[PDB]
Each structure stands twice: as C-alpha cells, then as structure tokens.
Amino acid sequence: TPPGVVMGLAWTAMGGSTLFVETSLRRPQDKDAKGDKDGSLEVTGQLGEVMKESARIAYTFARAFLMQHAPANDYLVTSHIHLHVPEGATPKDGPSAGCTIVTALLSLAMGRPVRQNLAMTGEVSLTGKILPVGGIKEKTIAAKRAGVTCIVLPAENKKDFYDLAAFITEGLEVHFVEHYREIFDIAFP
Amino acid sequence: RNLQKQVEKVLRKSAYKIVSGEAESVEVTPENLQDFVGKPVFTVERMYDVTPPGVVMGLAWTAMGGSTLFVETSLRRPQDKDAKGDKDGSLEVTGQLGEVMKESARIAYTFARAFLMQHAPANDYLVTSHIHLHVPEGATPKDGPSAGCT
C-alpha cells in the first residue's frame, strides 16, 4: 500500500469487505508559487450526499489537524486533490470509514506510508472523537483473511470485540482509541 | 421499553440457573450482574468534556426524547494569507440542514460578525477568517432553529 492508498473495511450487506481507498494530487503544485488558493478536494466513489458532506467535514478536520501539527508544510492548503471511495459498504455503515480518509490525506502529506496491513474502521467526529461502530464480527473475519496485523477500534467498543468467538481473534494486535491523535501516534513512531 | 427487555433477559437467564443451576435463590447484585447480562453497553456518560473553542451543549427535541447535541466548527483556512486583501470568510454549514436552518445560520453569522465589531472593533477574527460549521442532524424540523442560540 504505497503512499496515498490504503485498504479499508466495509460491512457489506453480504459479509464484510476490505475495499481500498485512494487519493491523489490533482493539479500542478506551482502554477503560482505565491498563489493563495484552496487545495480543493474532488471526492468520488458513488457517494450519497450524506457522505459528500461527511468527506468535506473530515477534510476540514484533516486540514485543521495538519495546520496545527506541521506549520512549515503548506501542501494541503494549496493543491487540488481527487479522492476515490470504492463501492461496497452497507449504507448505514458507510460513514464509519471516514477516518481512513483522514489518515489517507495525512499519508499523502508526509509521503510516509502507514504501518503496514493495518486495517482500521470507526466513525469520527470533528476533533478526532472516535465513535463506537457495529458489526465487529464480519469485519474481523474479513480482516482475518486479509493479512491484518493491528486493528484499531473505538475505545467504547472493546467489550463487543471481546464477545467474539475465541479462535477468530488469535493473531492480530488491537488498539482502542477516542482521540484520532492516538492513531496518528500509532502509524508513525 | 429497552429496559423492559433488558430485565426480561435477566429474569430469563435467572430461570435457566434454577431449573438446572445450583443456587436455589438468585440475589442479584451490581457486581453479580455480568453473569446475567454481560459487559457494559454505555460507558461514556456525556460524549466528552467540552473542547474550549468550538462546542456548546445543545439540547434538541428529536423524535424520541431530547438529546444534547454538540456543535462543531472550525477555522477553514489559514488566517493571515492576506493581511490586506479583503474577502469575507464564509461559513459552510452542514449536517443535512433544513432550509429554515439555512436562513437561521445565515442570520446568525451576520449578527455574529455584527456583534464582534459592535463590541470589539479592534478584533476582526470572525469577519475575515474562514469557517466550517456543522449542526448535527437529529433535531425535529420545527425545533432546528432553536439550536441557533448555541
């Protein structure tokens, strides 16, 4: 999964899935070296508008996190970026993958890949407040066959993860979280 | 309702422990409860302690009882790209707003920057800095505007 591409879980109406997510720069960086102009997103992936807003709010939270984090870098403020969300999630579970995008853009910023074969899901709110998500079972069995090493899950959901049949959980490392900054503290030691 | 069920499960597993279990008398206790209902569902009491800049608890009368939505907003862009260039920093409200909320939020922003100069002329942070805004969905269509005070 080189930079700007990541696998992603989805709770399909039939079983789980690990659809990927992709992001890319969309225009030359230096059309105007001084130009003060938005690095506008252009999302795609047969999104319903309920998603199309959510990608945007996530976008704003990413750009906020980044500007809070790395003042010298100005990448994200100014360059067009196209983004793809492959079909497959059951719609009620669609927003749940928002964080992966939030992480994708960051990888596209640093140009440094995530820790490998690190599936992750869970809804997020605008200050990185991870929220509990359902369907841990199907997501787990899908990941088990996907080479996953280190799932990260809502800190409010661990019990449900611990309600699953024993042999399933063997192997993979897990992490529980509330603030997204933790995830950013995992992927980049 | 949901507590009704969540009791029925307790009594039911308690029956199973009688007809074949060892103790003749269940004496449920808060600590004993795991055996009968398992691990907790709700652990965070409120969603979280307020983030100082951009949240205020907002009560709302959704279809099934009231709820304390948070509302989250953020500066949408660097503030000092142009200390002199003069363009408004508009909101982008979201959250599957109803049209009345559209009008409501527009009024709120304009009154907001009207207030900021009304009382703190030297400050200009809101009149000339970008803003994303997000009212959560959930509110009854009629009460949507009632969040506007927050």
Side-chain angles (χ1 to χ4, degrees), chain A:
Chain A
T1 62
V5 75
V6 178
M7 77 188 302
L9 280 44
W11 177 11
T12 311
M14 57 88 69
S17 50
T18 182
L19 60 83
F20 275 65
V21 160
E22 303 152 338
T23 285
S24 164
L25 205 53
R26 211 192 85 79
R27 281 191 201 180
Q29 57 281 16
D30 189 76
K31 54 188 71 180
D32 270 324
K34 61 167 198 64
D36 44 12
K37 286 174 263 171
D38 194 325
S40 52
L41 183 75
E42 173 177 0
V43 71
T44 66
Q46 197 262 340
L47 303 195
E49 290 296 359
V50 61
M51 200 58 60
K52 300 286 294 204
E53 59 204 354
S54 190
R56 207 73 57 191
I57 67 182
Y59 182 14
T60 307
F61 175 43
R63 194 176 271 145
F65 184 115
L66 182 60
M67 61 190 303
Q68 168 173 5
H69 183 296
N73 173 337
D74 75 346
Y75 187 116
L76 182 43
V77 174
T78 177
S79 286
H80 311 74
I81 281 178
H82 191 104
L83 160 58
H84 175 86
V85 164
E87 183 63 5
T90 298
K92 176 52 53 181
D93 312 331
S96 309
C99 176
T100 56
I101 295 94
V102 176
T103 315
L105 309 174
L106 296 168
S107 288
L108 176 56
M110 278 65 75
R112 299 177 181 176
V114 191
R115 175 165 78 169
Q116 295 66 6
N117 59 57
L118 183 150
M120 58 170 203
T121 180
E123 182 51 46
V124 173
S125 180
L126 289 175
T127 316
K129 204 72 195 198
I130 287 86
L131 318 180
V133 290
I136 295 288
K137 168 174 195 69
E138 318 93 334
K139 303 180 179 184
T140 311
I141 183 53
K144 196 72 168 77
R145 52 189 191 197
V148 68
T149 310
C150 178
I151 194 72
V152 308
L153 297 187
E156 321 200 346
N157 213 350
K158 76 182 168 59
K159 71 95 185 183
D160 196 331
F161 169 56
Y162 281 156
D163 266 6
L164 260 54
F167 68 94
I168 284 173
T169 287
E170 307 309 330
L172 64 92
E173 185 173 10
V174 57
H175 295 337
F176 293 118
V177 295
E178 56 200 8
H179 194 198
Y180 171 84
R181 177 175 31 76
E182 306 147 40
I183 283 174
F184 177 47
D185 291 328
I186 290 169
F188 300 79

Side-chain angles (χ1 to χ4, degrees), chain B residues 30-47:
Chain B
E31 56 75 12
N32 178 22
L33 169 67
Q34 297 294 338
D35 283 323
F36 314 147
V37 181
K39 303 214 84 66
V41 180
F42 298 78
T43 179
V44 304
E45 312 307 341
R46 77 180 62 164
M47 188 186 286

Side-chain angles (χ1 to χ4, degrees), chain B residues 31-99:
Chain B
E31 56 75 12
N32 178 22
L33 169 67
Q34 297 294 338
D35 283 323
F36 314 147
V37 181
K39 303 214 84 66
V41 180
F42 298 78
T43 179
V44 304
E45 312 307 341
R46 77 180 62 164
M47 188 186 286
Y48 59 123
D49 160 70
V50 301
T51 176
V55 296
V56 176
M57 286 67 70
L59 317 173
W61 175 25
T62 177
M64 58 210 69
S67 49
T68 177
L69 307 174
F70 276 67
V71 166
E72 306 159 273
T73 70
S74 58
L75 177 56
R76 198 199 165 74
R77 187 170 304 186
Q79 58 181 357
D80 198 1
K81 322 178 303 310
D82 286 324
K84 277 67 61 164
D86 44 1
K87 298 281 93 173
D88 65 341
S90 298
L91 272 62
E92 188 178 9
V93 171
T94 58
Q96 176 41 291
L97 64 97
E99 62 82 10

